[PDB]
Structure formats: C-alpha cells, structure tokens
Amino acid sequence: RVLYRQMIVDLEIQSKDKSYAWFLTWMAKHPQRVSRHLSVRTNYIQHDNGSVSTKFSLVPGPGNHWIRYKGAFILIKRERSAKMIDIANGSPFETVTLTTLYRDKHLFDDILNEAKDIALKTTEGKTVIYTSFGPEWRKFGQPKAKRMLPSVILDSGIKEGILDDVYDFMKNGKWYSDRGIPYRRGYLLYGPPGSGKTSFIQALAGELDYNICILNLTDDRLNHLMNNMPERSILLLEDIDAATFSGLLNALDGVTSSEETITFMTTNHPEAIMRPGRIDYKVFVGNATPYQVEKMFMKFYPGETDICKKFVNSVKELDITVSTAQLQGLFVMNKDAPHDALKMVSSL
Amino acid sequence: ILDSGIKEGILDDVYDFMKNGKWYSDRGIPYRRGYLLYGPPGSGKTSFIQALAGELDYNICILNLTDDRLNHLMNNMPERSILLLEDIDAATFSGLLNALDGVTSSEETITFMTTNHPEAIMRPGRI
Amino acid sequence: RVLYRQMIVDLEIQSKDKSYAWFLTWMAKHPQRVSRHLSVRTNYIQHDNGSVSTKFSLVPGPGNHWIRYKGAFILIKRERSAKMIDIANGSPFETVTLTTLYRDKHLFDDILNEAKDIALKTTEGKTVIYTSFGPEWRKFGQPKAKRMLPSV
C-alpha cells in the first residue's frame, strides 16, 4: 500500500470549493468514462408567476467511477460525510478524490483548466452603472452589455485625441509617482445637448471595461461620493455648470481624494477650474459635420455609396441645429430603406 | 374589439420589435420602444394592453401619475414585463423626459402610454 | 515508542491559527520534499460585473508527507476531524503536525520565520485618512501610499 501510494497521486476537491460543481460538470461531458452511479441536480426557477423553468442533469454522484483522459486511467471517488453538515448549502460535507500515478500528476492542472473552461464561458462583457443613494453608491440598471466604440460617431480628430490621452494617462504611473503628484485627471466634454457625449463616455468606459459611477447635480456628502468609488471605475459629472462651487473645487482637489480617478465632465454651455489637477483636457463636440453625416450614413447602410453623396448635398440645405441625435432618430424610422430617408430626412 | 386595422397594426409592430435585436445592437442604439394609445376614456385601451401582455406572457408594471424615484421605477422593472404609463398628460415633465431616455434606463423595455387627450415627446427613442 | 518520542519533537499548528495557511504556502514552494497528496485551494473573485478573476493552487492536503529542510528529514502530517466544525471558516477542524528529532528543535522557529517571510512581503506603506462622521471617526479614502518627503 505505501509503495503504490507513493507511485500514485491523489487530489481532494472538497465540497466547499467552487471547483466542485465545475469538475462534476466537466466529467459529465467527458466522452470516454465509466460512471455506474448517478445523482440528479435539478434547477428549478419559479418566476413571480406560477410559471416554472426547470431543468435536471445527471452527475457522477457518490461512489467511485473510472475515466481515461489521455491514457491515464484516472480513478475517482466521491464521498459524503455521515456526521458533519455544511451551513453554506445546508447539505452534508462531500469530497471528490482523484487518483492517478505520480508520473501523470501534471495532468491535473490541465484537467481543471478544461473544467474551468466550461466554467469560464461567461463572456458577459458589460458596464455596470453605479449611482448615488445618499452618501453611498448603489448599483443601478442591470449590467447591460457595453456599447461598441464604433457606435459613437463624432468629428474627424476628436475620437483619437482622447483615446490616446487616456491611453497615455494609463501608462504614466511612475511619472506621476516620482514627482509626488496625485494620479488623477479630468476631462471637459462640452457642446450642445444631443451631440453624442454620453454615448462616447459609455463607449470609452466599455473600452477600458470600467464602471460609470454617474452623478448629476449636498456638498458635504459630495466629497464622500467622490472619494468612495468602487474598483475600476470612471467618474462622470453631469451638468457641472449648475453650481455649491467652493465645495466642488474642494472635493476635486484638497488632500482628501481618491488615488486613480479619471473624471469626465459634460456641460451644455461652459460659461479657475481649468487649472491642471482639475480639468485639463477640454474639447468641443458639437453639431453634425459633413464627415459625421457620411460616417453615420455608411454605418447604417453598408455599401451603397451612390446614395451617400445624394444625401449629403441634400442635407447641406435646411440645417440650423442639425445634431446626431436627430440624425439617429430620422435614421431609425426608415430602417432597411434609404430611399425613404432621402425624402423624409431632407424635409425636417 | 377595436377598429378594423388597429388590431394588426400593433400586433405586428411589436412582433417586429421582438426580432430586431441584432439590428438594434449593431447600430449602438438602446433596445426599447414606446407606444401612445390615445382616445376618449372607455374605448378599450387597457383591455387591449392586457390582452397584448397576455399574448407575450409578460407582466404589466402599471404606474399612474416623485420625479427622483420615477427614474428608479422605470429602471427597476422585473423580468419579462411591459411598462404602462397611465395619464401621461398630467405632467414633472423634464424629469419625465430624462427618465424616458438619459443614459440610465433599462435595456429591453416596451412602454405603452395612454392618454385621454394628447394635447418634443414624439421623437424616436421616445414615443 | 516513548523513547523515540522523547528523542524527537512535535509541533502542532491547528487550523484556527493564522500560521496555518502561511505554513502550507511555504511548504508548497519548498524545492525538496515528497508530498504525495494534494488539495486545491481556489480563490474566486466575482466583481460587480459578471467578470471573474480566479486562481487555484495545490497544497499538501490531508495525509502525511516528508520534507528535508537542512538535513532534518521532517515528517509532517495533516489531519481533519470527522466530528467538530469550526464556525470561523465553516470547515471541519484541521491540524498539521510536524515531527523531527529533538536535536533540531531550533529549526522550527527558523522554518516559521521563512513561512512568515513569504507572509510578510506585504510592504503596504500607506497613510489611512480618518474623517469625522458625527461624533465618531470613520476611515475615508482607501489606504493610498504615503507621499514621499522629497515631493514637498
């Protein structure tokens, strides 16, 4: 017995670990094995209605099985404890024990990785939006997928003049640390309402997979909100032109702030704050340009270049406050039909 | 029981809006839609809304007309629901428009709106 | 048995002590040993998003192993209790028992120090900022590293 144990390995995964359900799920889908025993796991969702979504799946279950991974002949046992009870799931304490030779010990990580992979296909890719609830940030608006960077269409150079300033600010940790200055940066996206500011901020947060802790305009707790931001976040200050001003400046910089905090600021009309450490990158996103209209028309209708010019020279006339929200509205009502847009959008 | 064509002009608009997920996703626009059933009181509006919700087996999160929490109510709807706004002609207006669309809404939210006399809101993305 | 026990020492580290995870972490990275058994420890962080940062690491796990520290041939057992349950971590009560000769008893502190060292590489060096919350001081502004004296 001692000699065989030495020439063999074991691996105990106990029921507390998260890699217990993962491993059983993996071994259920393994093609070549022999698992004489089985245990049902039934998920069962009752909605607010009496309607039920239920699904059952069989798993190895208690007692030993066999498996052949890469020519290994792994022996697996699963055992339950007759005396101890876990309080996390209210079930007796279970344990899975894998056992192969010592020579193939390096397979276990591989195996777990495969299990992990069936576990890892989460791919949520989404941008949680926090919000203010008194002096504390609460989640708000169920984790919807982050908007694509292309979705936002602005002027020719502004898309790159900011996507590289931030990308520089993410690589200057040592430069900001050795000088003894705080590692923060502000931004002032300003322009007319409906120019695509918020869409760009959401696209950028999706680019850096951070979370927008939005805050729209109380001054004593404003500092607490600025200071207490979750991990991997991007602050947003809507309508900074509505103001407590001294407390605002104090909260922005006053030896009581957070360490790494990017803070964009949007205003509809930006008329001391422009000093570095405070707001230091100001750019004007405004109404639609003959480049913006062309890029929107080509985003909606792939191909079909001929109509594009016939639209642009048409929109050159009767244009006062032509904005991209208006183009978006007048482009969704004529979907999959540019010919209707040619006469509809031209008159508005 | 309503007029000859209105029963199909809406039962196919919604059925189109339930099949345009990719179209709304690739363009980068939110996946929502509003409706404005308007007419005299007692015309069978609410009956039609309930019949439609029964068709799609959703749940009517009814709300009749506070503005700071109106956004929270719009945002926090249960799964598989159809919002209903009774008497939208009784109004906070700027907060109403903000709650309807302001980069802080829900993802898939159909929202019918009924009024007894419907006299900026008519823009797409809104009604 | 009594004579060998007298000429040998033991050292019980029980699962309540903070020096339990430290010691297993140390013995995982020891180059020369023979640990036939293994136990997974999987850290698993779910952020506010569905995104997951997870990492698993193998440790000696229950049952006895061997190790050679400085020419000692230390024998180590790790055991679980079948009846008692700790409430601090919700797991059964575990215990690691080291056993060498009496002559090399002075190694244990050294060993634990090494383990402590892999534990001690914290080096946070930071200045928490308290603040007023009514008539009571609350932490405020996550423990950022203290600014260098030269900076001023």
Curated annotation (Swiss-Prot), chain C:
Top-rank taxon: Eukaryota
Compartment(s) where it occurs, according to its Swiss-Prot or TrEMBL record: Mitochondrion inner membrane
Family membership: Belongs to the AAA ATPase family. BCS1 subfamily.
Miscellaneous information on this protein: Present with 1990 molecules/cell in log phase SD medium.
Function summary: Chaperone necessary for the incorporation of Rieske iron-sulfur protein RIP1 into the mitochondrial respiratory chain complex III.
Record's protein name: Mitochondrial chaperone BCS1
Originating species: Saccharomyces cerevisiae (strain ATCC 204508 / S288c) (Baker's yeast)
